[PDB]
């Protein structure tokens, strides 16, 4: 694990036990140990650490996506794939900057990079059914990552993997 | 004024996450937005818990009526789960959506929420053994993805885009 990922891990659990707001190089220097300056020597900027974590996210999906895809080559094994991983409920450091990505174009961009190779493509849903059936799909699998935090009642192990059962059967 | 001085302030608060966040919202910060003084703001919200609490009230109210508005024979669930992904199917805000993720904090801000959410959001009970229960909880978590998709995906939805999502997700429902 290189210094970089470990600074970036560490903002991460931070923002989530604090806030994205209080991260600062201050802050960030007090939770990994290090002097500001090690820190901006491989963040020179809070945007650059910012982007970094958006990345980071990103890049553990991509190859959660790729370690328990059957064929890669099947849009519908990617897209089981897709929903088996976002059937685990989202980690609040996850779901905070996730929130925060619309701030700015790079921070959606580091997202886009893996979304636009998982995610069911959008265009032409307004008239093919086929797209939109998929694209359902999607739509639940979502719900499922979010549920906890938009639902006053938690889903129990076994009522969240009956949902993920009910949303994998949706699969064509 | 087209509302009351209360639900202006609250209103204000709410635009100031939008532009800022939860994070930094205080008596100083919405003085500063609303043009008031601390003290005004005190008078009609004795503690930061208070203001939060009417946050949530507000949104938990403003959904309520919305709800009302445009679900006819509300007395069939059918009908109620209807009109929630409708209402679903536009954006959640990021302020509101910073509230939801909030509201676990203190008892006072989910019941806020369980109030209207008991009238017109599918319990999960009895979720392993009930096929009707699962298939309109499907229908209830496809309209929560719609909810939040902008806040959740880089690419935000165009309006034709969700519109042809809803028709698609009411089509799910049992009927």
Redesign the interface.
Known sequence: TSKKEMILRTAIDYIGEY????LSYDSLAEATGLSKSGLIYHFPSRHALLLGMHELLADDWDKELRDITRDPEDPLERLRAVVVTLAEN?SRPE?LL??D??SHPDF??A??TV?HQW?PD?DD??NDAHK??V??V??????????D?????V??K??RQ??LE??LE?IP
């Open positions: 806030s994205l707001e209080t989202v779901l996730l929130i990505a619309p959606l961009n997202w886009r979304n995610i959008t849903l307004e939109r059936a694209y359902l999607q739509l639940a699998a979502d719900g499922l990552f979010v549920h935090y938009i639902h006053d009642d889903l129990s076994s009522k009956a949902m009910t949303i949706l």
